[PDB]
Amino acid sequence: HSFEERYTQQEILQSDRRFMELNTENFSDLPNVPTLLSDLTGVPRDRIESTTKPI
DNA sequence: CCCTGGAGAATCCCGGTGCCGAGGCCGCTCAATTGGTCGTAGACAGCTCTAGCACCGCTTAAACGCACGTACGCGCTGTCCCCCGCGTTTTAACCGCCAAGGGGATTACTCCCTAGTC
């Protein structure tokens, strides 16, 4: 029972971007979240800004 | 593909007779006019006083364009579910039937209130 099944792709990606937004310790790295997530999983910043829906 | 002759049926409408009440007519009738008073409250200044008209230079706070962007009102698809028109049944007021009081008037017996004369 993988959590990728109970939680859909959108939900696991939301958990991931919340994780990366917990990684930062300052204001300045909040726009660095798309860059960090693209470095992590290789997703373009377009869908990061379009579908992640951050805090 | 979509239009309609015929038919079923609802509408508009004026004769066409019966009814009850809108309006006129009659008999009171009571309240608005009107004489006055006398004194009350608002018009007429008048002094006052008090908030606003326009003016000056700033201050960035809102206002607006531009560009991205993105998701929602609306319009497309389909089904499904549920309410209507019609057919059958049952409460639901309304008007007749009957024998007995209640009573309101209505009149009959009578009995006291009234009033006359040898």
Curated annotation (Swiss-Prot):
Domain of life of the native organism: Eukaryota
Location in the cell: Nucleus
Job description of the protein: Participates in the catalytic exchange of histone H2A for the H2A variant HZT1, an euchromatin-specific factor, leading to chromatin remodeling and changes in transcription of targeted genes. Indirectly involved in vacuolar protein sorting.
The protein's assembly and partners: Belongs to the SWR1 complex at least composed of ACT1, ARP4, RVB1, RVB2, ARP6, YAF9, VPS71, VPS72, SWC3, SWC4, SWC5, SWR1 and HTZ1.
Name this protein carries in UniProt: Vacuolar protein sorting-associated protein 71
Organism of provenance: Saccharomyces cerevisiae (strain ATCC 204508 / S288c)
Residues represented out of the complete protein: 84 to 138 of 280
